[PDB]
Amino acid sequence: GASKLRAVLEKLKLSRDDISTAAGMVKGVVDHLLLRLKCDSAFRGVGLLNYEHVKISAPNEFDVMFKLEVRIQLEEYSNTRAYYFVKFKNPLSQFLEGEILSASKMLSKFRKIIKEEINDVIMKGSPAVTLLISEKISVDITLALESKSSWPASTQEGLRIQNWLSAKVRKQLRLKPFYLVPKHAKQEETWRLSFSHIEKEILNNHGKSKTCCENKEEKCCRKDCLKLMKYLLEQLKERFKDKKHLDKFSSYHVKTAFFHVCTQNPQDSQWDRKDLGLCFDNCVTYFLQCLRTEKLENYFIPEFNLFSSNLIDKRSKEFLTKQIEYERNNEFPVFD
Amino acid sequence: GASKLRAVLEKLKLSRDDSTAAGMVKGVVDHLLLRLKCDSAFRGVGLLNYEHVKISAPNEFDVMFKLEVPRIQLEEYSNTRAYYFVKFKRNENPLSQFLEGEILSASKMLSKFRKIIKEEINDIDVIMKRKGSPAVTLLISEKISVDITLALESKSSWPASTQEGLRIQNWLSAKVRKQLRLKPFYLVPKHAKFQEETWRLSFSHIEKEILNNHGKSKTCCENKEEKCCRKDCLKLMKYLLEQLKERFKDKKHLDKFSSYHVKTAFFHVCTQNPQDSQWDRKDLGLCFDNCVTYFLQCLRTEKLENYFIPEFNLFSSNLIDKRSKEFLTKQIEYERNNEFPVFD
Ligand SMILES: O=c1cc(-c2ccccc2)oc2cc(O)c(O)c(O)c12
Ligand SMILES: [Zn+2]
Numbered sequence A: 001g002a003s004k005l006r007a008v009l010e011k012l013k014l015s016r017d018d019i020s021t022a023a024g025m026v027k028g029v030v031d032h033l034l035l036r037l038k039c040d041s042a043f044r045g046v047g048l049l050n051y052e053h054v055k056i057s058a059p060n061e062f063d064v065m066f067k068l069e070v071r072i073q074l075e076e077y078s079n080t081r082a083y084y085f086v087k088f089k090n091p092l093s094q095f096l097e098g099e100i101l102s103a104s105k106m107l108s109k110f111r112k113i114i115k116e117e118i119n120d121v122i123m124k125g126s127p128a129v130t131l132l133i134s135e136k137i138s139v140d141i142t143l144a145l146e147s148k149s150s151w152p153a154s155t156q157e158g159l160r161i162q163n164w165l166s167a168k169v170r171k172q173l174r175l176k177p178f179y180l181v182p183k184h185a186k187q188e189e190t191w192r193l194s195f196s197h198i199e200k201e202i203l204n205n206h207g208k209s210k211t212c213c214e215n216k217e218e219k220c221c222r223k224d225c226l227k228l229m230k231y232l233l234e235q236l237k238e239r240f241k242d243k244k245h246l247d248k249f250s251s252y253h254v255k256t257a258f259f260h261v262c263t264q265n266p267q268d269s270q271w272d273r274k275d276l277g278l279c280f281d282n283c284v285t286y287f288l289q290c291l292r293t294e295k296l297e298n299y300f301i302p303e304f305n306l307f308s309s310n311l312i313d314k315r316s317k318e319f320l321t322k323q324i325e326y327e328r329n330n331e332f333p334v335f336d
Numbered sequence B: 001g002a003s004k005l006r007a008v009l010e011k012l013k014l015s016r017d018d019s020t021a022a023g024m025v026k027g028v029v030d031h032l033l034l035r036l037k038c039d040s041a042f043r044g045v046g047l048l049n050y051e052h053v054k055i056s057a058p059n060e061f062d063v064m065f066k067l068e069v070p071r072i073q074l075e076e077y078s079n080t081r082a083y084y085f086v087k088f089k090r091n092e093n094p095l096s097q098f099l100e101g102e103i104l105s106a107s108k109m110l111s112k113f114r115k116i117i118k119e120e121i122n123d124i125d126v127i128m129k130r131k132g133s134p135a136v137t138l139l140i141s142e143k144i145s146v147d148i149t150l151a152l153e154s155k156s157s158w159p160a161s162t163q164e165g166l167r168i169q170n171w172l173s174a175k176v177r178k179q180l181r182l183k184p185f186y187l188v189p190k191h192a193k194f195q196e197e198t199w200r201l202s203f204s205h206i207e208k209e210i211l212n213n214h215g216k217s218k219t220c221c222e223n224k225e226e227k228c229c230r231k232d233c234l235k236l237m238k239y240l241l242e243q244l245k246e247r248f249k250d251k252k253h254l255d256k257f258s259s260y261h262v263k264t265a266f267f268h269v270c271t272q273n274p275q276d277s278q279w280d281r282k283d284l285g286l287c288f289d290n291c292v293t294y295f296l297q298c299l300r301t302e303k304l305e306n307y308f309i310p311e312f313n314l315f316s317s318n319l320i321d322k323r324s325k326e327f328l329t330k331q332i333e334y335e336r337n338n339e340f341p342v343f344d
């Protein structure tokens, strides 16, 4: 049924040319918001990270990250390995609550400046604000702190790309800044580590060979497998939207499992385009293994289990398991 | 006979460890940069990247002090492709003090650059020698020499003369080439036959990235199954020339050949042989022979394109006469036929 997979990839691509117009309508709104946010003292160093599509099957839905550079001191929240309070060694004295930078107050002023500027188009805390341009194009804007200091110790044994993309690349990436998005912690003044910029780099520079996918001899199917993985989750989440079991699952879980599959199979020849069918089947099978065993390490923070009982109930996992297994046993009817 | 080559590489490796001199240099270099950043004209001073233009003289170091010049326009000198006048699109400019007309005076900044160097070094013990591609030569303690070059940093698109250079697409990939060309380029003061206020394009930083990240596979030389001999071949090429230059120091025939010629020829060979399996360590002997052969082919045809500036022939007869090329040709040919006795 590999030809059906490529039938899916055929349609996912044709909608991209039909939405490159939508990305222009987003760039315009974003540039105006940054102009006025930069006028404010607290957001003077605002800028962009990475348009991107968390939901691939929703081409009119974009995700933008506004970055704000800060020299911080970080305090891990309750050994979460991923959530922190951000103390200091400043334009953000506004948002200090004791010695902690308040996500709530910083998020507040963030929204208000955008809600005021958008009146020139409505607004609806990972996704801080969500805009609706006209009535078809939506964009989720996430605020993020940028720190050009060395990465937190909870990242020391993550990003295991050495045998795939090389230890030299791992040192290169780990010299880049890391990011922090305001995110509730099961607490309201915590920040969660983000590496969306690193995720994009290794997604678009994904082969052991530097010339992977730049010639016919080295066409691999890494990218096609992840898109098919995202598309199947998104389709399953929409067929069962009014049952809510699949609501806690996101494309990030699929993206993480894919990075782990890349680590397990680091050779370009294990991703030959001729083998799209079995490559995707193996990708589904690993995700299923993460569901059954309830283990899905954050690719950058290995002690952070995305699939822990405290985050997703077993009944939700077993439901997605059964649905996916039914799809695989029937040549994925949900793809149409 | 590849084992004698390994004997050479064993020798070159031993003299690098006996890195302490490099620690002395970084000390004087950091004190020197501190004092130049105090001047309004050199506030953007910094380092680009130890560098050994002569692999057989570990005591001799080469350093580049870069200085960012925002929003410049270049004007090519006499269609040389490599030497330009530097003008600015604004004026506000800290280096306005060095304009002669609308062009930045290479000699006027070089004079102040040299004056600040000799002034600050006198407070330490090392002297400053005159060389103007390297502006100064620092003699540190017993026998450490430091050649200091200043270069302007421009973050604009690379000059059009480089449009079809850096042909690494089939080797290091088209996206690596795109990435490297988004990095800045550099301009060093250099006279052009002579015109006295020109600046020459420098890509020394791109040259380092490509040598230290040289494989088609990203894990090249990171494991035993992917050990290659690219870097060893260049070492052996630079060493062969430096030895032959020393033996013939009296005939003045080899005086215009430099490690840069070897380096450039090596890059063209890397383009010719993009696959890592053509550089297996088991074939060090054959791979070095191929490198020697290509450099000889450049010598006989009098054609060595600058790896970034394809229309600049480093082996032009205006630069090195035919006799010098044929002399060096015959010497290398003799060395190869006799298992390179100049290595002994
Ligand atoms: O970076 C260099 C560039 C050029 C060059 C020569 C002709 C046309 C364009 C560039 O020559 C050099 C000569 C050297 O001896 C050396 O150490 C160098 O680093 C360079
Ligand atoms: Zn690929």
Ligand SMILES: [Zn+2]
Pocket (backbone or CB within 6 Å): B214, B215, B220, B221, B226, B227, B228, B229, B230
């Ligand atoms: Zn190598």
